[PDB]
């Protein structure tokens, strides 16, 4: 029975799961856009969201300093986080990262892939799923309803 379980089984146990997600978070912090399996990236998204919230607490906060020391295993990334990522994310509360589904790997595994990235990264944009324009037929027909609702008030 898996009722009320939010953490999925990864690696060789809980410690190995924490270490693999630590490696993924270190790579995401260093490169600002990484691709991996869909489940590992989906687990990584919450860690990457709360890491920005811990970096928001300031450089002088000892708990955040030790959290970043443990989780960012390459020691150059802690000044990089506290002087790049935390000043850049100030206004928005929880919109730090983007998760998108990459097509399956060309290796024989045919695993389901996802790419994770941060906002404002210095990289070319991913081919985001664009909505229809407002000149499209259904959008124009609904803008007619919107105009008649504005004319009714």
């Amino acid at each position: 029975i898996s009722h009320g379980r939010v953490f999925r089984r990864l690696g060789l146990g809980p410690e190995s799961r924490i270490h693999l997600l630590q490696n993924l978070l270190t790579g995401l912090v260093r490169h600002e856009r990484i691709e991996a399996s869909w489940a590992r990236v989906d687990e990584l998204r919450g860690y990457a969201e709360k890491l920005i919230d811990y970096g928001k607490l300031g450089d002088t906060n000892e708990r955040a300093m030790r959290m970043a020391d443990f989780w960012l295993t390459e020691k150059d990334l802690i000044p990089k986080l506290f002087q790049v990522l935390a000043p850049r994310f100030q206004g928005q509360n929880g919109g730090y990262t983007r998760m998108l589904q990459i097509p399956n790997r060309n290796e024989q595994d045919r695993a389901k892939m996802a790419v994770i990235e941060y906002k404002g990264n210095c990289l070319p944009p991913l081919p985001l799923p664009r909505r229809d324009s407002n000149l499209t037929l259904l959008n124009q027909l609904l803008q007619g309803l919107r105009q008649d609702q504005e004319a009714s008030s």
Binding site: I1, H3, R131, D132, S133, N134, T136, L138, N139, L142, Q143, L145, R146
Partner: protein, 279 residues
């Protein structure tokens, strides 16, 4: 024609998505939501447990006559909590468009005598139940999936340490040597939990008017935040308790006086109480 699949959010643009988003008679039962559980205390000092059943949106949907449903009692159709338009089916939205109400989650059928019929499209409230009464509660129980025979039926297992090899949870012998088969009534591992069960004879202690919350005594089958089918008790000892109830149904408009906020049974220790002492 190899037509592709579509949904409501496919062809909508970001400027239009928030635009789219913007003596022998029987009574009528309710559909509620199991909120949680609370302690409660009585004036003799004992402690009971109440399950919280919140009515959020309860409306009678359609009425099936006596001769077209069962031949003894008519059928009244009651819907549950209100869900989205976009994820329901076309015929369901068409019949609810003719009815006049937004889509409901669960749809249930109640057996109701002809003198207790309610015109369809009528809302219902928790003051339909009065403090001090006995109710029957029907719900889908907590689904435990494909469970073994030890958890599903309660069989004693084989010992663990005394040499037994690959045996510790298996049922063992399932049938008899002569009959050369296994009986249809044999207890065997399989699906456990996702079935419709009814608890009988649950006592109501308190009705909360504004949030429409019924407090029932004991355990309600099913997990928290599901939809729960509530009716009166069909036990033989509680047959004739219909007389002191508001029995067309509860009408808040016809009374034209306000009910109290919290309606209690006379044995309940209130939150506002003299902090009872003995003598």
């Amino acid at each position: 024609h190899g037509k592709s699949v579509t949904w409501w959010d496919e062809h909508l643009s970001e400027e239009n998505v928030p635009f789219v988003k913007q003596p022998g008679s029987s009574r009528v039962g309710l559909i509620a939501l199991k909120l949680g559980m609370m302690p409660l205390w009585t004036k003799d000092g004992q402690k009971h447990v109440v399950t919280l059943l919140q009515v959020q949106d309860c409306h009678v949907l359609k009425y099936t006559p006596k001769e077209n449903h069962n031949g003894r009692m008519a059928a009244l159709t009651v819907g549950g909590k209100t869900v989205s338009h976009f994820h329901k089916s076309a015929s369901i939205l068409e019949f609810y468009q003719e009815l006049g109400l937004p889509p409901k989650q669960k749809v249930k059928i109640f057996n109701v005598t002809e003198n207790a019929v309610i015109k369809p499209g009528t809302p219902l409230y928790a003051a339909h139940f009065r403090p001090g009464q006995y109710v029957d509660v029907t719900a889908k129980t907590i689904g435990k999936g494909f469970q073994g025979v030890m958890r599903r039926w309660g069989f004693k297992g084989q010992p663990a340490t005394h040499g037994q090899t690959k045996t510790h949870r298996r049922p063992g012998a399932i049938s008899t040597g002569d009959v050369a088969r296994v009986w249809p009534g044999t207890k065997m591992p399989g699906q456990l939990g996702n079935i419709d069960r009814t608890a009988f004879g649950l006592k109501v202690w308190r009705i909360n008017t504004k949030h429409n919350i019924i407090y029932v005594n004991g355990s309600v089958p099913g997990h928290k935040n599901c939809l729960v089918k509530i009716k009166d008790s069909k036990l033989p000892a509680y047959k004739d308790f219909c007389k002191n109830l508001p029995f067309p149904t509860y009408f808040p408009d016809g009374d034209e006086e306000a009910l109290p906020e919290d309606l209690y049974d006379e044995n309940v220790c209130q939150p506002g109480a003299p902090s009872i002492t003995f003598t």
